[PDB]
């Protein structure tokens, strides 16, 4: 049921969590935010780090 990401879709595939603990979305599909692999260090979503 829950939706995520900037695309407002259900979970699928590999997803990353915003490192802003105040993020209102938290989880993002890799493809939606241009990722190919897990970031090894910090990662902030396009809404938190515009």
């Amino acid at each position: 049921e829950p939706t995520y990401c900037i695309c407002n879709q259900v979970s699928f595939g590999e997803m990353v969590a915003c490192d802003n603990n105040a993020c209102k979305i938290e989880w993002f599909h890799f493809g939606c935010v241009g990722l190919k692999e897990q970031p090894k260090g910090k990662w902030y979503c396009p809404e938190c780090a515009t």
Partner: peptide, 6 residues
């Protein structure tokens, strides 16, 4: 960064 695989 944290990730998950669904």
């Amino acid at each position: 960064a944290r990730t998950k695989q669904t």
